[PDB]
Each structure stands twice: as structure tokens, then as C-alpha cells.
């Protein structure tokens, strides 16, 4: 140990700095905030299909089309206003855990226990959906993937790394590192100039896409961080762990703001998302249901109890008009 | 509705009829999960059968389709993806009998067997246990008593008994004694009949699952 004795003192040096920026608290400021009322959402649509458990779901940019992935080896694109099915894409491997819909609407991505990200083309002059590219190089299972534009995508793998790819060639441009535990989730900033990731060592890191460096590390959870999502302004994010608790972090205060826990909740959190204004926080649980939290006061505002098994996916449209939740009973529901 | 919207509905109905055909075809195949230790003999049973993250194998025996999955090449937290395989028909566990002296390795296998057999997800799946290398195992025990591996072994240093003492120390790790049976076979590299044993080990599982689909 030539210098391992000074890393501990360096870590102790940044503790007292994130603790001299804590004059007040979020509660001490939002104490007299108006209550959010009693949120009541009702199921408007139910999408039937996908015989097996549903693992991933993502909304399109036009807030009308969404894609879902299931373990029967199918990708289905739905028209949510009319419950119609637009496409059904058969997968080469049936062990899938991730789907993304591009911002332009021309491609979708997939991945799972085959350590490969597959990209499909939805606008072809032949009537079908074709594989456009397969990206290989991760040595563990693929857990999340998020499009940047038509020609870039960020993936996180169980081999404790994240990568940035070029699709027209099929090679990595940057490789992010530092986690010592499998990465399980990704979230892109609204300007897509940086992103946060959460791993199984109960830590979250922020990285910027250009330089490929790590900026800040956030600690405070007790077990694996399974979901992550960024506030709409882009200066905060929320995490969901297996210790039955969500936390809110500030990128400018560089510390913790608020924790959302109840004494009658014991199961882990599978998904997390914000509403359009950032006032509500949607969280999915193994309790078979989904809580909503007043983000500014950390009080439950309502429940979403309509599923017969574990809630695995959860997302909100870009105009904040509907919430879609997937589950292990092979059903998709749209609320309010 | 307009003609163009009525034609979208017709297309949607056309493609969900194909989703039913594929679902019925996949509910007839039986799927198996191949687990084991490091170089325990998992790379040999597949060649007994007719036959990069995971590898899938396909073979047919007496008008029955089989699908075997291998997850050996995956060093990722098992608790994060092992739930993907719940609902599998059965599990194949390979244990090399000659790993007693080696290094320890047999203890690592007893720990791995104990952990997968007593899982939360696998609470009603049956386990088919293969004890490979029963031939090379003979050349060692006569010059190496089992006490170097099992200290409290109260018995002789002979094949007839040392082979039945590991089978009982593996089948005793079960805790839900009743909902799960364990079928243990003694394989020998040129055994020529493992696939038959798997066949009439999964026939009983099919029968038991038929007694549930009728609620009997």
C-alpha cells in the first residue's frame, strides 16, 4: 500500500464539503407547499397479446406509438389510441430485457442474455421489418440501451461497463468504466450531453458523452439500484433500490435531497419515472401495484392497483397525458 | 370508421392470429436448463444427445421436441437473471464423481446444488442429477480413500458403497422434500442411454403437470 492510505483521506475530504453546503433541507423549504391532493387514475386501455411476461416498454416521441418486449421472442408496436397492432417483429433470441424506440421513429433496438444489441429498420421499401445491424463486444448481458440519434446509441452491460456505439460501422467510440458491480439502468439528459447509470454496488455515476470521463459519484443506498430517471429540468435525478426506497439527488448540490419510504412497504422498486412538470414521481413495485409520490413533500398521493403480478416497466408520454405500465401477467395498461 | 381505418383493423386482426399459432407451437416443446460446475461433464452430455451469452440445442426423441439451454459462459450476478428461467420443465445438474480429491471442488458443487435446488423460483421443478466420470473415478478411490473428501465417512473404500454415499449426500440437501423429485443417474462417457433416462424422467413431469391442468 504505497498510496492506498491517501484515497481514504481524499474521500473523507469531500465528505465535509458536501456537508457544508447543507444549511437547509428540501422539507424545511417546501413545508408550506400546497398539498398535491388525492390523485385518482383510471385504466383507459388494455393491450392484450404477448403471451409471456413483459420485460421492457418504451414510448414513441409522437406520444401515440409504443413498443413492448416479451420473453416469447416478439416485439410488438401498438397504436395506443385505437389498440391496433402495427408491427410484430420476431426475435432471433427469446431472452430479451431491453427495448428503445428512436427519437425519429425509424428504428427500434433490442437486447438481452445474448450480449448483442440488434437494430431494426421500420421504413423499408419491401413491407417488412429488417435487421439493420448487430453490435457485439459486451461480455455480459445487456440491461439497457438508449438512442442518442439515428446513428448513436448508449448501452449498459452486466460486465460493469457502458459503451457508445457508431451504428453505420458497428464499433464502440467510448467505453465508460469505474463501476464495480453490474450496470442495471441508464438515463439520458434532456439535452443528451451526459447520462447517469446505476449499478449493483449501490452507487450512481454521471458521465459526459464527449470526453468519456466520470464527473460525480453518488452514494447512500443500501443495495442494488434497479431504476434511474432524470428530472425534467436536468439538474436532479431519482433512483430506485431493492431496499424499498427512492432517493432524489442534486447535480449542483452534489448530495442528497429527499427519501421516499413507508414503513408498510418492503419489496424492491422495479421502475421509476417523473411526470411532465416534475411534481409527481411514479414508482413500480413487486407488491403488484404502483405508488405515486408528491415529489416536493414525500407523501403518497395515490395508488395504481390493477396488475396481477410484478410491475416491470413504467413510462410516461412526452406531453404527460398518459402513463403506461407493463407487468409479468402479460398485460399493458394505460392510465388517465 | 373509414375504409383506411377499417383496413388497419383487418391487418391488426390478421397478425394476432399468427401470434396464436406460434404460441401453440411453443407450448408443445419441452425446455431444459443445463447447470453444473467448472468442467464437470456438461461438455459431454450434449454429445450423448443427438444435438456469446447462452447456447441453445435442439433434438427430437420419440416425436418429442427438446430445447436445452447452457448458461456456463456467463459470469454475471445470478440473482439478476435466474428468474428468467422459472417455468422451465426440468433442470439438469452435472457433477463429476472424480472431483473429490481435486482442488474442494466437490464442496463447491454441493454448495451450488444446494443454492439452486432451494431457490424461490424453482420450487416445483424437478432436478435430474448426472454423476459423470464413474469410470475414471474407480482408478482413484482404490489408491485414495474417501476420507480426504468426506471426513465423517463411516464405510468401506469400495465402489459399491462410496458411489451410494455421494448420491445420498446430494439428494439430502433438498428441503422441500415433497414437491420436487430428484432423479439421479450414474453416467460413464460411453453410456449410450442417457437420453432415454431423460425421456422417462420428463414423462413423469408431463403426467404430473397434466394432473394439475385438470385440477385433479
Amino acid at each position, epitope marked *: 500500500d504505497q498510496l492506498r492510505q491517501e484515497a481514504e483521506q481524499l474521500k473523507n475530504q469531500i465528505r465535509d464539503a458536501r456537508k457544508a453546503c447543507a444549511d437547509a433541507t428540501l422539507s424545511q423549504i417546501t413545508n408550506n407547499i400546497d398539498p398535491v391532493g388525492r390523485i385518482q387514475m383510471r385504466t383507459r386501455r388494455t393491450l392484450r397479446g404477448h403471451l409471456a411476461k413483459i420485460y421492457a416498454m418504451h414510448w414513441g416521441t409522437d406520444s401515440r*406509438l409504443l413498443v413492448s418486449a416479451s420473453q416469447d421472442g416478439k416485439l410488438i408496436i401498438w397504436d395506443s389510441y385505437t389498440t*391496433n397492432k402495427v408491427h410484430a417483429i420476431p426475435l432471433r433470441s427469446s431472452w430479451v430485457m431491453t427495448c428503445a424506440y428512436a427519437p425519429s421513429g425509424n428504428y427500434v433496438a433490442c437486447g438481452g442474455l445474448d450480449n448483442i444489441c440488434s437494430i431494426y429498420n421500420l421504413k423499408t421499401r419491401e*413491407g417488412n421489418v429488417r435487421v439493420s445491424r448487430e453490435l457485439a463486444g459486451h461480455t455480459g448481458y445487456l440491461s439497457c440501451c438508449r438512442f442518442l440519434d439515428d446513428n448513436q446509441i448508449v448501452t449498459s452491460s452486466g460486465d460493469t461497463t457502458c459503451a457508445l456505439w457508431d451504428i453505420e460501422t458497428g464499433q464502440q467510440t467510448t467505453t465508460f468504466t469505474g463501476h464495480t458491480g453490474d450496470v442495471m439502468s441508464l438515463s439520458l439528459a434532456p439535452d443528451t450531453r451526459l447520462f447517469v447509470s446505476g449499478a449493483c454496488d449501490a452507487s450512481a455515476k454521471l458521465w459526459d458523452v464527449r470526453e468519456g470521463m466520470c464527473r460525480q459519484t453518488f452514494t447512500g443506498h443500501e443495495s442494488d439500484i434497479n431504476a434511474i430517471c432524470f428530472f425534467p429540468n436536468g439538474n436532479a435525478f431519482a433512483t430506485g433500490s431493492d431496499d424499498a426506497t427512492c432517493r432524489l439527488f442534486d447535480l449542483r448540490a452534489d448530495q442528497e435531497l429527499m427519501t421516499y419510504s413507508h414503513d408498510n412497504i418492503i419489496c424492491g422498486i422495479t421502475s421509476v419515472s417523473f411526470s411532465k412538470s416534475g411534481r409527481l414521481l411514479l414508482a413500480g413495485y413487486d407488491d403488484f401495484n404502483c405508488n405515486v409520490w408528491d415529489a416536493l413533500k414525500a407523501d403518497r398521493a395515490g395508488v395504481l392497483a390493477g396488475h396481477d403480478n410484478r410491475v416491470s416497466c413504467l413510462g410516461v408520454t412526452d406531453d404527460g397525458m398518459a402513463v403506461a405500465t407493463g407487468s409479468w401477467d402479460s398485460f399493458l395498461k394505460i392510465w388517465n | 370508421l*373509414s375504409a383506411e381505418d377499417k*383496413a388497419a383493423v383487418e391487418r391488426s386482426k390478421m397478425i394476432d392470429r399468427n401470434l396464436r399459432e406460434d404460441g401453440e407451437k411453443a407450448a408443445r416443446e419441452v425446455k431444459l436448463l443445463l447447470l453444473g460446475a467448472g468442467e464437470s461433464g456438461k461438455s459431454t452430455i450434449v454429445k450423448q444427445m443427438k444435438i456469446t451469452g447462452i447456447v441453445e440445442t435442439h433434438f427430437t426423441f420419440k416425436d418429442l421436441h427438446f430445447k436445452m439451454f447452457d448458461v456456463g459462459g456467463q459470469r454475471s450476478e445470478r440473482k439478476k437473471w435466474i428468474h428468467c428461467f422459472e417455468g422451465v420443465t426440468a433442470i439438469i445438474f452435472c457433477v463429476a464423481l472424480s472431483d473429490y480429491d481435486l482442488v474442494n471442488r466437490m464442496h463447491e458443487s454441493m454448495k451450488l446444488f444446494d443454492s439452486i435446488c432451494n431457490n424461490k423460483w424453482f420450487t416445483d421443478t424437478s432436478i435430474i442429477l448426472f454423476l459423470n466420470k464413474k469410470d475414471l473415478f474407480e482408478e482413484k478411490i482404490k489408491k485414495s480413500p474417501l476420507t480426504i473428501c468426506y471426513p465423517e465417512y463411516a464405510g468401506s473404500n469400495t465402489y459399491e458403497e462410496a458411489a451410494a454415499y455421494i448420491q445420498c449426500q446430494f439428494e439430502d440437501l433438498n428441503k422441500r422434500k415433497d414437491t420436487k423429485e430428484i432423479y439421479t443417474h450414474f453416467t460413464c462417457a460411453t453410456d449410450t442411454k442417457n437420453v432415454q433416462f431423460v425421456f422417462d424422467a420428463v414423462t413423469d413431469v408431463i403426467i404430473k403437470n397434466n394432473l394439475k391442468d385438470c385440477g385433479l
Partner: single-chain antibody
Framework: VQLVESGGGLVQPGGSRKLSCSAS????????MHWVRQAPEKGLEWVAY????????YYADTVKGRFTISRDDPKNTLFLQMTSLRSEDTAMYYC??????????????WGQGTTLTVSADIVMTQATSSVPVTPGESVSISCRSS???????????LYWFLQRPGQSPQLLIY???NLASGVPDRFSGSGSGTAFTLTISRLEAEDVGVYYC?????????FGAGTKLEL
């Protein structure tokens, strides 16, 4: 993508004939197919339609009974059986493919055409049949319907086609405000209700031809008269 048709020829009145149209280069089984004919020196006229799954068929009132449409998906071929041929069925028949889902563009690829010589419904009032024009200047083309094509789901079902001299029609604008993939950006479409307009800017020596407006609101598809653009 390719469509080749054959079967036409000289015929005596009261006879019979069979036309074929063989696809090549696209997923033929996923497309609905139409037959559209054009009289000698007159305009376009829809004939029949067959469903993707062959579970829906429509006919024009003028060929009902005599004509019957069918498809053979394993061989990728489309047929049209015609009997008791009158002297007013001599035309050039076309093979058109169309696919229907949220965001598609129907009527996008037309066949090459096979000639045949023998021996309540919305009307679409076309503008003046002839507009003189020079390169550079921008012109406008006006169609007018006898019924509002704006449905309650928000879509307006109007289509624009261009037929160059000596070729088959090609799609320009679908659902009145969309640009078909492959055409330049100088074409645009406006209007709403019963009056529509197509405006082209800085025309080159490639927009000469006749322009057709078509409605896809109801069952029997109808076309405009067509307006020529001469240089």
C-alpha cells in the same frame, strides 16, 4: 420492387380474357392490390380491390358480375377474370399495391400497364384542363369535391398523382399534407374541407404531365378529370 402485367390483346365483344400481374422484390402477401384502368385519351378509373388476406373484395358498379379478382400468394401473382366484354372496356389496365397501417402511404407503386382492345358517389371537380407554363415560375393546381373529405379522426383523404408523358402514374402527396418518399421538396399541398390546392415552386423540365386528385374516403374510389401542364 417490380410489377409486370400481361394478358391483354384484341378481343371480340362477348368474349373473355384473363390478366396477370406478377410481383418481384417485396413482401407480396402483406399488400392489398387494386386494378385501375385508363381509357384511350381520357382519364383514370378504379376497377376492383382485393384484401391482403384475400378476405375483402370490392368492385366498381360498372364491372360487377362480369369481373372477378383473385390472388395467389405462394406464386406471387394477381389475376382478373373478365367475361362478356363490352366495347367500352377497351383501356390500359394497371396493377397497384397499397398497405394500410398508422402512418403508411398507400397507392405508392404502380405497375407498367397492359393494353386491351375489344371489337351517392363523390365527385371530384377538377380545375381548368390546361395551364400554359414556362420554367422557373410557380403554379397552383386546384381540386374541388362534392363532399367534405375531413373525417372525425382528423385525417383528410386526398391524394395527388402525376403521370408523365409515356409512363405510369406516380404518387406525390398522400392525405393532402404529406410528401411521398422520393419526390423533391418543391411540391406541397394545402386546403381543407371541399377545396384543395397543390402548389409547386420553381418547376423544372420534369413536371410536365397531367395531375389527378383522388379521394380515399369511401368504398368506390373516384378520380379527378386531370389537368395538363404544357411548356
Amino acid at each position: 420492387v417490380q410489377l409486370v402485367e400481361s394478358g391483354g390483346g384484341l378481343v371480340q365483344p362477348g368474349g373473355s380474357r384473363k390478366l396477370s400481374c406478377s410481383a418481384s422484390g417485396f413482401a407480396f402477401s402483406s399488400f392489398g392490390m387494386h386494378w385501375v384502368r385508363q381509357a384511350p385519351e381520357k382519364g383514370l378509373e378504379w376497377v376492383a380491390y382485393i384484401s391482403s388476406g384475400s378476405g375483402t373484395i370490392y368492385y366498381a358498379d360498372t364491372v360487377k358480375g362480369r369481373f372477378t379478382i383473385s390472388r395467389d400468394d405462394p406464386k406471387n401473382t394477381l389475376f382478373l377474370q373478365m367475361t362478356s366484354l363490352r366495347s367500352e372496356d377497351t383501356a390500359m389496365y394497371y396493377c397497384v399495391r397499397s398497405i394500410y397501417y398508422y402512418g403508411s402511404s398507400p397507392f405508392d407503386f404502380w405497375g407498367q400497364g397492359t393494353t386491351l382492345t375489344v371489337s351517392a358517389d363523390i365527385v371530384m371537380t377538377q380545375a381548368t384542363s390546361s395551364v400554359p407554363v414556362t420554367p422557373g415560375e410557380s403554379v397552383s393546381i386546384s381540386c374541388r369535391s362534392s363532399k367534405s373529405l375531413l373525417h372525425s379522426n382528423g385525417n383528410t383523404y386526398l391524394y395527388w398523382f402525376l403521370q408523365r408523358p409515356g409512363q405510369s402514374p406516380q404518387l406525390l402527396i398522400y392525405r393532402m399534407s404529406n410528401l411521398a418518399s422520393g419526390v423533391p421538396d418543391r411540391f406541397s399541398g394545402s386546403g381543407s374541407g371541399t377545396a384543395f390546392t397543390l402548389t409547386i415552386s420553381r418547376l423544372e423540365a420534369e413536371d410536365v404531365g397531367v395531375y389527378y386528385c383522388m379521394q380515399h374516403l369511401e368504398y368506390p374510389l373516384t378520380f379527378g378529370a386531370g389537368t395538363k401542364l404544357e411548356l
